[PDB]
Amino acid sequence: MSVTVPDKDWTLSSLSETFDDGTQTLQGQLTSALNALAENPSNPQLLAEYQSKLSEYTLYRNAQSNTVKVIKDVDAAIIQNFR
Amino acid sequence: MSVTVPDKDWTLSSLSETFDDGTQTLQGQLTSALNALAENPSNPQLLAEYQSKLSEYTLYRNAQSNTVKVIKDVDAAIIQNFR
Amino acid sequence: MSVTVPDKDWTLSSLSETFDDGTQTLQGQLTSALNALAENPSNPQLLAEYQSKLSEYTLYRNAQSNTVKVIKDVDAAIIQNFR
Amino acid sequence: MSVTVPDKDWTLSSLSETFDDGTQTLQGQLTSALNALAENPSNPQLLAEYQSKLSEYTLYRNAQSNTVKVIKDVDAAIIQNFR
Amino acid sequence: MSVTVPDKDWTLSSLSETFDDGTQTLQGQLTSALNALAENPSNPQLLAEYQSKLSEYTLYRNAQSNTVKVIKDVDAAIIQNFR
Amino acid sequence: MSVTVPDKDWTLSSLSETFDDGTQTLQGQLTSALNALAENPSNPQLLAEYQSKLSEYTLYRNAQSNTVKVIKDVDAAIIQNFR
Amino acid sequence: MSVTVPDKDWTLSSLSETFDDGTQTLQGQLTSALNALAENPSNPQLLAEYQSKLSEYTLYRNAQSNTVKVIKDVDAAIIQNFR
Amino acid sequence: MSVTVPDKDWTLSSLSETFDDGTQTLQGQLTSALNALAENPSNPQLLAEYQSKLSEYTLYRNAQSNTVKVIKDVDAAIIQNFR
Amino acid sequence: MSVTVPDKDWTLSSLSETFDDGTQTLQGQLTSALNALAENPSNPQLLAEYQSKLSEYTLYRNAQSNTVKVIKDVDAAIIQNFR
Amino acid sequence: MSVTVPDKDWTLSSLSETFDDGTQTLQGQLTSALNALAENPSNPQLLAEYQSKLSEYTLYRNAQSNTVKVIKDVDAAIIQNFR
Amino acid sequence: MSVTVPDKDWTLSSLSETFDDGTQTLQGQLTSALNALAENPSNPQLLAEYQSKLSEYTLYRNAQSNTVKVIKDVDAAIIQNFR
Amino acid sequence: MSVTVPDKDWTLSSLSETFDDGTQTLQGQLTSALNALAENPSNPQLLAEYQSKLSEYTLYRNAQSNTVKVIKDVDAAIIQNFR
Amino acid sequence: MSVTVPDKDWTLSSLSETFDDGTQTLQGQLTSALNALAENPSNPQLLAEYQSKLSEYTLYRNAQSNTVKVIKDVDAAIIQNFR
Amino acid sequence: MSVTVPDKDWTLSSLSETFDDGTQTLQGQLTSALNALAENPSNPQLLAEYQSKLSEYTLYRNAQSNTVKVIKDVDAAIIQNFR
16 A cells, blocks of 8 residues: 655654554454453463464554654654754 | 454453453352362262363463453553653 | 735744644643543553653644744844844 | 643643542552452452552553653753743 | 551551561461471371461462562652653 | 732842742652651652652752843843943 | 755755655655555564664654754854854 | 751752661661571571562662752752853 | 671672672582482482582572672662763 | 951952862862772762762862852953943 | 872872772783683682672773763863853 | 783683683584484483583573673773763 | 675665575475475474474574664764764 | 874874774674674574674774764864854
8 A cells, every 4th residue: 555755644643543443453353352262261262363363462552652652753853953 | 242442442450350250150160069079079070070160260360360461561561662 | 724924923922822722632632541541541542642642742842842942043133133 | 531721730740649549549459459368368369459450550650650750851841942 | 458548658568567477377387287297297187288388388478579579660660760 | 929010020039039939848848758758768659759849849940040040131131232 | 976066056955855855765665564564463574674664764854854954053153154 | 857948958968868877777687687698598588578678778779869860950950050 | 697887888799708608618518418429329318408408509699699780780870870 | 157248358269269178178088989989899888979979079160160250250341341 | 098189189090090900900800700711611609700790890990981071071161161 | 810901901802712712622522422412312421411511502602692792881881971 | 705895885775685585595494394284293303394494583583673773773873973 | 003193194084994994894794794694594603703793883883973073073162262
């Protein structure tokens, strides 16, 4: 998916929304797997799927918050250089 | 069972309550099997049911406390990245 | 949004009001996210939204006070050159 | 819960009080769970509840002191720009 | 047992004393069971009671030192954020 | 609190006294928190309150001495223009 | 690429445009890598490419705004010396 | 313990002496616990007390040197503003 | 054994020497037990004494090097705060 | 300590001598602390005392040279006004 | 060891020489411990002594270069105030 | 083996070469023991010698790379303090 | 393989491409071993080859991303020193 | 190597060339070690040599750019004093 020159379409919210909306479905699957295990804890497959999606979820938030942190630094650097 | 977008309904307590309430009945069965064995230790079936539920109980707490640990890491990671 | 020739509509207060009023809503969201976390500290999404808006708020004040500082220099420079 | 335009109701103490009072009850629960374990260390549920609230407490102080630190930076930045 | 708002009655020593004094009696029982086994090693009940209390003692120290470690982290985190 | 036309009630000492007397109570609280920590260093709340008031104290002196510096410039500017 | 004697072709905008246009393509790649990760967060290569380009982007803005800052100083220095 | 208006009784040495003298006794206890362990390394209680006081000692010096650092900044800020 | 105010008698070497000299005798016993087993490997008592002292020796070095590590942190923290 | 009407006892040397002689003892303490650290670098207290006095020494010279600078301005201003 | 009024015997080289010569012997011990480990890497005591002296060496250079940095600031501050 | 004042003979390469050359022979013995086991896997002595030297080799690289890391920190610290 | 003076041929992309292209073949082997195990999980040799290449792959990415991180630091350090 | 009175042979380019040419060979070794690891990532020695030279390279650029920065300050200081 091509992105219009970021120069003009640099929006921090949009970047976060990408990380959110693109994982919202996967978050539902994670919590669905939880409910599945609640019914049947003794399913190795559900345990694997749940724990995988759970570990992935951790990575999902890591990438999200890290990206935002970087953008903050960029914005602040500009302000400081023109401070 | 579908879950409302976790983004908004991320509650650690709720996650634990799932592990608790969904097993409370099974915990009663475990301790009931204990009482059954107290009356008749010499029932292989009761021994199997008790020991199975007991082993399952171990797994029940493992999944519970592990999930919570992961969520802790996620929360802390966010705070640190915005620290 | 086009601005009438600043030459005549150079008002320092107006410049600040832009930074204020345009963020007032976002400041409400920030403090609202605080209240949300007060109810549920264990929501990664709310933590991300709060901390993001909080970091943004920092940037909001940085841009505001910096702009004003610059305008001060401009005004003083004129007075000095015609002092 | 809606907040009156923070511009006028920016109070650092109030922000801290939010983190304090909103957790005071939870802190009581934590230390209550400690007392519960003092009576019965061998209750997995109490161990989970105690350790969860304890881990949460850590997060409670992290969010509190971090928020305050940020506000300090904001205040100082303004003073410096008008120094 | 209700605890006065910990905010003001956060004392690390007190927390440890809870773990100590509340187990001191149980530690006496453990070492008493040792003496009992010294007289009669061939008592399964005394072996069970001794080994149980011994295993419990291990857990007693685990919970104690772990709690203290956590509190250390909390204190240090505050100092660092205001460092 | 309304102020009588500063034109006539421009007093540098008064300006400083505002910064002093209005914080004297808070300075007592700061040094009181120090004494509190001297008794119990292991109270996160006291650490937060102390370090907060300490950081605030820094800001208290910053605003004070900065205001005075500005007034000096104003007075000198007048003298120079009529020198 | 040789540049016509800068003496005559010193244009601040042109300098910035160099930093912009020469990275616009790379910015597209960065945001494209984001979209790629949105589809597949679990690709180490995409993570490396994204994070690399992201870190590079930070450097891209650093060099840009720094260069401009320097030129500002040069222009101001001339004006002051002939002020 | 109430403190006479710090304005007049701001003494950096006194602040340090508070951190020192108030912990000197505790430092003796720490090194005493060391000697206790030297005689009996195999006492969990002495290990806990020693390591606790040792960790506390670390915090004792952290709070001390941090406070002094802050005061330095305050003093320097005043001098600079009246430099 | 009482220790003169550590403030003045804080010596890292001395701390290590405590761990060393106080165990040197015990280290001799350990290596003596080794020689005893070399003559008679089939003595359960010597095996217990050797393995106990060996396990203790491990703990002896753990406590030693850990204490030193902590002191390093303390020294460095001071230097950094006054760096 | 009361001072005879400065009008007649305005001596720049005397002002400097105040800053010198009043700190000479403290300078000896600083360099003495250096020698103390030369013997025992691993004493946190000596590190704190040395670094504190060292930081103070910096402030000692700052106040000294600043005062003198101001007096220079005063003297020159008089000469210029009667030039 | 008493030092002649530093006012007259302020020499930066001398300060460094203190840090150097007073540690030169200890540096020899460090590199000697290295050679000792080269012969016998499997000596815990030599590992402790080496690593301790190595960590100390780090602190030795930290204190040295830090002191010099401070003195630089002092010298420059004087020159600037009389610039 | 005595070392010439390290001050002048501080060479990182030399330090590494010590760890290398002093173990090269031992590395040959390790890989020789491998070849010995390749001929006779069923020799407990060769298994002990191989596995011992292998474990030692691990320690050999640990000490090597750790020492170098420390020296890096020292060099960087100096540069930063004079940066 | 000799490299042309890096001074002129310092390209971060090229460095990464080295880590990529030089392992691409090995990555194919890894995923090929996976397919081999999919057909025959019960082949110890394939398990060893797969798990070895998998562990190696981990190391492959570690070296790659680490190198890039270092180069980032170098670039940023230059910009900051000339900022 | 003796240097002709720098007074006359102060050339910034020459200073940089020293840092460059004197490391160019070492840079080749670094990138050569990279190629060596590309062939054999599993050589601890090559990993040590590469990572060492890489860390050294970082230090090489740090010393280079820092020296130049200082010289800039010197040149500018002269111009300003005669401005």
